[PDB]
Enzyme design. Structure first.
Site, PDB file in Angstrom:
ATOM      1  N   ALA D   8       0.752  -1.220  -0.092  1.00 42.40           N
ATOM      2  CA  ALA D   8      -0.318  -0.425   0.164  1.00 42.40           C
ATOM      3  C   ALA D   8       0.959   1.730   0.424  1.00 42.40           C
ATOM      4  O   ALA D   8       0.103   2.262  -0.297  1.00 42.40           O
ATOM      5  CB  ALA D   8      -0.443   0.234   1.451  1.00 42.40           C
ATOM      6  N   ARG D  84      14.512 -10.079 -16.774  1.00 40.89           N
ATOM      7  CA  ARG D  84      13.541 -10.634 -16.525  1.00 40.89           C
ATOM      8  C   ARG D  84      13.175 -12.301 -14.767  1.00 40.89           C
ATOM      9  O   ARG D  84      12.284 -11.929 -14.181  1.00 40.89           O
ATOM     10  CB  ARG D  84      12.222 -11.595 -17.264  1.00 40.89           C
ATOM     11  CG  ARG D  84      11.248 -11.552 -17.009  1.00 40.89           C
ATOM     12  CD  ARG D  84      10.430 -10.260 -18.414  1.00 40.89           C
ATOM     13  NE  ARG D  84       8.935 -10.618 -17.776  1.00 40.89           N
ATOM     14  CZ  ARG D  84       7.821 -10.582 -18.020  1.00 40.89           C
ATOM     15  NH1 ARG D  84       8.291 -11.370 -19.542  1.00 40.89           N
ATOM     16  NH2 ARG D  84       6.724 -11.031 -17.682  1.00 40.89           N
ATOM     17  N   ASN D  91      10.074 -11.414  -7.267  1.00 42.73           N
ATOM     18  CA  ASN D  91       8.682 -10.900  -6.306  1.00 42.73           C
ATOM     19  C   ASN D  91       8.353 -11.965  -6.490  1.00 42.73           C
ATOM     20  O   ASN D  91       7.145 -12.250  -5.599  1.00 42.73           O
ATOM     21  CB  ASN D  91       8.113 -10.903  -7.630  1.00 42.73           C
ATOM     22  CG  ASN D  91       8.592  -8.734  -8.090  1.00 42.73           C
ATOM     23  OD1 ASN D  91       9.647  -8.304  -6.764  1.00 42.73           O
ATOM     24  ND2 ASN D  91       8.061  -8.128  -8.819  1.00 42.73           N
ATOM     25  N   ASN D 116       3.783  -7.962 -10.461  1.00 46.66           N
ATOM     26  CA  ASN D 116       4.898  -8.705 -12.149  1.00 46.66           C
ATOM     27  C   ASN D 116       5.482  -9.592 -11.720  1.00 46.66           C
ATOM     28  O   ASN D 116       6.535  -8.910 -11.200  1.00 46.66           O
ATOM     29  CB  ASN D 116       5.219  -7.149 -13.231  1.00 46.66           C
ATOM     30  CG  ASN D 116       3.526  -7.112 -13.929  1.00 46.66           C
ATOM     31  OD1 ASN D 116       3.067  -8.185 -14.222  1.00 46.66           O
ATOM     32  ND2 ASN D 116       3.884  -5.322 -14.309  1.00 46.66           N
ATOM     33  N   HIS D 171      -0.343 -11.272 -19.886  1.00 50.87           N
ATOM     34  CA  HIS D 171       0.431  -9.565 -20.077  1.00 50.87           C
ATOM     35  C   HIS D 171       1.811  -9.052 -20.016  1.00 50.87           C
ATOM     36  O   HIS D 171       2.594  -9.042 -19.210  1.00 50.87           O
ATOM     37  CB  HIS D 171       0.160  -9.063 -18.310  1.00 50.87           C
ATOM     38  CG  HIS D 171       0.490  -7.867 -17.937  1.00 50.87           C
ATOM     39  ND1 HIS D 171      -0.473  -6.993 -18.677  1.00 50.87           N
ATOM     40  CD2 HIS D 171       1.071  -6.790 -17.022  1.00 50.87           C
ATOM     41  CE1 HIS D 171       0.173  -4.978 -18.622  1.00 50.87           C
ATOM     42  NE2 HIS D 171       0.576  -6.002 -17.527  1.00 50.87           N
TER      43      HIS D 171
END
Ligand SMILES: NC(=O)C1=CN([C@@H]2O[C@H](COP(=O)(O)OP(=O)(O)OC[C@H]3O[C@@H](n4cnc5c(N)ncnc54)[C@H](OP(=O)(O)O)[C@@H]3O)[C@@H](O)[C@H]2O)C=CC1
Ligand SMILES: NC(=O)C1=CN([C@@H]2O[C@H](COP(=O)(O)OP(=O)(O)OC[C@H]3O[C@@H](n4cnc5c(N)ncnc54)[C@H](OP(=O)(O)O)[C@@H]3O)[C@@H](O)[C@H]2O)C=CC1
Ligand SMILES: NC(=O)C1=CN([C@@H]2O[C@H](COP(=O)(O)OP(=O)(O)OC[C@H]3O[C@@H](n4cnc5c(N)ncnc54)[C@H](OP(=O)(O)O)[C@@H]3O)[C@@H](O)[C@H]2O)C=CC1
Ligand SMILES: NC(=O)C1=CN([C@@H]2O[C@H](COP(=O)(O)OP(=O)(O)OC[C@H]3O[C@@H](n4cnc5c(N)ncnc54)[C@H](OP(=O)(O)O)[C@@H]3O)[C@@H](O)[C@H]2O)C=CC1
Ligand SMILES: [Cl-]
Ligand SMILES: [Cl-]
Ligand code: NA
Ligand code: NA
Ligand code: NA
Ligand code: NA
Lengths: 307, 297, 297, 307
Positions: D8, D84, D91, D116, D171
């Site tokens: 957030a 990548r 992540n 992502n 995506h």
């Protein structure tokens, strides 16, 4: 959520049903009328469905005429109705015909009485339905308050939603405007520049007569009451827990007054009346409220005798 | 913005005026009716105002019976109306009474015709008013397609918003459903019976109930115009060669609608049969339009 | 309607522009920043457009750095900004750069100042622009009262919409809370600590987070103006004798706001102490305004 | 309804949290970040509360940093994120840290992955959380579809909401625009006058690059992704049962394809994915989808190895 409108063929019920169907929180509207009005309900259903297509909204629209068609509704809106005493007796019988014993088959039903005299019939409906005291309310003075808001807003030349006011007591000649709760933008009107130039007493007189005056001109309130019904049903179904002035059963919250249904500020949610807000009334305002309860109580006793 | 509703005391006009007043883009609604209807107009004004208060909305509501009460409106909604030809004749004369010469005093007016036969009377209104061709439209086959949409969404038991259909041509028996541009859930899709129901639906509801559907459709159109939304809506509009070279007729077509009215007629590609049906519908409509224009001459 | 946001690349300006574009009454938003910020403006434009698509909304988004890119806007929102006096001096010069002479090219423009000190800079903007006194306002103590409202609703554990308070005077340390016009559930109601928190809240959030509150307040004001809603809002506005005979100052007051800007300063009745506090606040604000005007001379 | 936004403090999470609080269907927003970001969350909370006052809306805004602060949320929005492959590994570890075992303490949680590469991480999150396959989705190509809608709407000069289109698949660079499902006002674009003048391939290229192009200009999508998140959460919490293109787990609904999370049209409601709409793809469109699944599956395998 299923909302049943009893008296859906009338001016009030048809317009209420059409605006209720547009609510996202209303998934079904059931149109209820007497058996011989079935073709009218079929046309109304088609027309409401057509309005829903134009608005790109969804609702199932069903029709019926019997107890089983609506007893299971989440909210039952009673708009069916036909000498004040003779009218009360006739409309009390309609209340009883449709709502007697509802609590047995649907103890969780909420009933909104619109039929006049609304304060008396809210009490009748409460008693005959057997439902908990918090689950039966009447439209009461909510529309009278909105009519007062119009007059005040026009005087100050402000958006109608900027005006907050409350009228309590009988939906009738003994209604009590609560100036001490009346404000423009949170600003008490007594502190507004120009409130001296507002003839409160003429405004109240206009509100008291607006109903019959609209009846003698347009033929009776239609869009106003339909929107007020829609606003109350939405407040309930979306559990908004907001204070509105409705006819609700009193059990000692205000001035120890008990055993009557009359217009008062009530916080409303999915379980119905969550609380009768104890309202801080000025001395003269409390006196007027008392005079109003006396009238409604006497009328209520007559109607209960009749049924 | 000011919207005038002529015929505000009728079933269509009163409901339309009430729903129009709820729009945030409508600051004033003027209710117009005949002199003898003044009392009804006053009661309607009070009832709409009360509805706005209950909705936390706001608008100025005025009333009138005379040209100067509505000619300066941004949008004039014509819902006033009383043999098919006798009906066309009498309603054409009503359009002429209220709308003749409007362009002289308010060249930027937009007129929305609802009175039937709406395609014919859109042309009548355009000619008597003197307004530019993009500023006068009619609400016609869109009403027919709303009903068709309800039938499609029921067949596929899908949400209303997931069905998109389009009916062009006459708001009547020569209406042309465009199956070419009918999708369900975004994917291209007893039609003959559904059409038969759609054609009869208006008299069917008339014979039972006597409103809300047309009123909401009117509201969507006025909103699209006043907020300059540029949506492709089916309206009765003057054709000047965009579809098949067809000219000099007002009929239901796809049109990009905005604050200036009809921004462009959108010539959707029609299958051969759809085009042939449209051409037949234009012929019918042109004939009825010639009768109406000669009748009010 | 077109709304230009000057300073659109800042924290306040970008969020305001994004929320303004969602309004149905806003057809075009123009993002204005300095020449070197062109790339940021282009990315912001694309991101706002995508947000509108995701919201089922729509608007034309344009960008610019020059006077001709925004002077024809219906509303110009001034959020661009860099010692208190040194700050006032530099931000006053920014207001003058962008707003000097606007009335010459767009006499009907409305200016909403957000840059601080907002009361001073509302006066600066009014004078340099040449606009009529009702067409230039500032967003000031309303921001202070929103925070105060949050404290009141928490104390009484009530809904936000049930609390209505009002703070007038300087958007700063001489702010005047009007307890006289503070209600809970419609009924008139440690205030000193709450005020202390309110005064420090802006630097408190600055020292932690660095937006959304001011952006939403801007959006409500522009909406009230463009839809001519006639609401009594607290804004920084030029006083010309309506309250206590006070003239020649821009300061937070109740004002009925509409499409023409300030329709009237509303002289609410103040208790004696509230009036005395307001008079002190006016004195402070007048002094700071005289310094700023002399600095940009 | 409680919605927790993890990450957030970021550009995405802060803006999403602010717009989610405005939803009537959202009663609480919990702002989650690492312990050292607590003061940032305190400022964000105050600012969101201030926006709610300006909008006259209600929401409880809480903050936290630990599993117990958000595990009980109805919806968990994962926006926290940092070669990548190295990015995916980093992540994926964040996903695991926050979502491992959620099913044990809150079997009814719904997770929306925004981090992502979203298709890979939606699969990671599904596997580590232990939740049912229908209760974990990713933003996927929903925002890519909205970006395509912008380009099409601008070309036809129509309101953006008039354009309906869908992009499916990864995506990323192997996204598949579905022209056969693209319409203007219900009218297939292939039938629109002017679709010949629309350079589809340039538009797709712009969509594929819009993310990094916005990152290099504005600094990264902010309002667009925040509104897309808000739209998905609302669709779920209000049980709207509408079809949106999201990254969802496939179990044989499309071309027998299984064991992957990738952008597809899914009907979404309160119980999450109600159904993977089997989409009628043109031959070349199905081929492209297959090439896209292959890329996402290989990347998914790498990330699962890493964790
Ligand atoms: N709360 C308020 O402020 C207001 C209250 N009201 C009250 O609401 C009620 C409805 O008013 P309105 O709709 O305008 O009246 P209408 O005469 O227009 O409609 C009457 C409705 O009641 C039904 N009805 C009438 N008599 C009977 C009966 N004996 N048994 C069953 N159903 C019956 C009708 O059904 P059918 O088609 O079979 O005749 C129809 O649905 C009235 O009692 C009215 O006083 C209305 C306005 C304001
Ligand atoms: N587009 C569509 O498909 C639809 C359109 N319509 C059309 O709208 C029109 C109105 O229908 P509706 O409202 O249901 O009918 P109503 O009988 O309910 O109301 C008629 C309205 O027309 C007015 N009016 C009638 N005759 C005249 C006249 N000679 N001069 C001026 N005003 C007149 C009435 O005014 P007053 O009160 O003074 O009598 C009233 O406002 C009709 O032409 C109807 O066909 C209706 C439904 C669907
Ligand atoms: N009313 C209130 O209480 C509040 C108002 N504000 C005020 O709004 C203003 C902007 O604050 P904020 O957006 O948070 O700050 P940011 O640093 O986040 O953004 C600054 C903005 O001002 C522009 N700007 C700065 N210096 C100049 C200059 N010399 N000439 C032109 N443009 C300039 C920037 O453009 P660029 O990208 O080219 O640098 C950018 O648009 C300040 O004055 C601030 O005090 C903010 C919060 C609350
Ligand atoms: N689905 C899509 O189309 C899009 C996806 N995204 C993805 O969303 C994510 C967030 O982007 P954005 O908000 O712009 O990035 P920012 O850098 O602006 O914010 C990063 C956020 O992630 C948190 N975070 C970063 N590293 C860690 C960590 N090791 N452990 C815990 N929390 C961490 C930050 O918390 P802290 O304050 O402690 O640093 C902060 O909340 C990225 O992975 C991005 O690629 C974004 C744009 C588009
Ligand atoms: Cl209605
Ligand atoms: Cl935002
Ligand atoms: Na509904
Ligand atoms: Na309005
Ligand atoms: Na807009
Ligand atoms: Na909320």
């Amino acid at each position: 959520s299923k909302v049943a409108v009893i008296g859906a063929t009338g001016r009030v019920g048809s317009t209420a049903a059409a605006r209720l169907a547009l609510l996202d929180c209303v998934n079904e509207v059931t149109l209820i009328a007497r058996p011989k009005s079935v073709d009218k309900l079929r046309g109304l259903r088609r027309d409401i469905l057509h309005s829903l297509a134009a608005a790109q909204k969804d609702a199932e629209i069903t029709i019926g005429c019997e107890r089983d068609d609506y007893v299971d509704a989440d909210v039952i809106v009673m708009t069916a109705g036909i000498t004040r005493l003779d009218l009360t007796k006739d409309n009390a019988a309609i209340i009883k015909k449709y709502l007697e014993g509802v609590a047995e088959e649907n103890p969780e039903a909420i009933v909104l009485v619109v039929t006049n005299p609304v304060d008396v019939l809210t009490y009748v409906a409460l008693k005959v339905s057997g439902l908990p005291k918090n689950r039966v309310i009447g439209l009461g003075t909510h529309l009278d308050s909105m009519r007062f808001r119009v007059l005040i807003a026009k005087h100050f030349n402000v958006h109608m939603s900027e005006v907050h006011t409350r009228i309590i007591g009988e939906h009738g000649d003994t209604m009590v405007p609560v100036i001490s709760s009346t404000s423009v933008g949170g600003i008490p009107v007594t502190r507004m520049p120009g409130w001296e130039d507002f003839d409160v007493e003429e405004a109240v007189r206009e509100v008291k007569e607006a109903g019959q005056r609209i009846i003698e001109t347009w033929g009776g309130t239609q869009f106003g009451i339909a929107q007020a019904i829609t606003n109350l049903v939405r407040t309930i179904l979306q559990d908004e827990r907001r204070v509105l002035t409705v006819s609700a059963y009193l059990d000692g919250e205000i001035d120890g007054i008990r055993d009557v249904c009359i217009g008062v500020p009530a916080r409303l949610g999915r379980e119905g009346v969550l609380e009768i807000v104890p309202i801080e009334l000025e001395e003269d305002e409390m006196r007027a409220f008392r005079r109003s309860v006396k009238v409604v109580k006497e009328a209520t006793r007559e109607a209960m005798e009749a049924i």
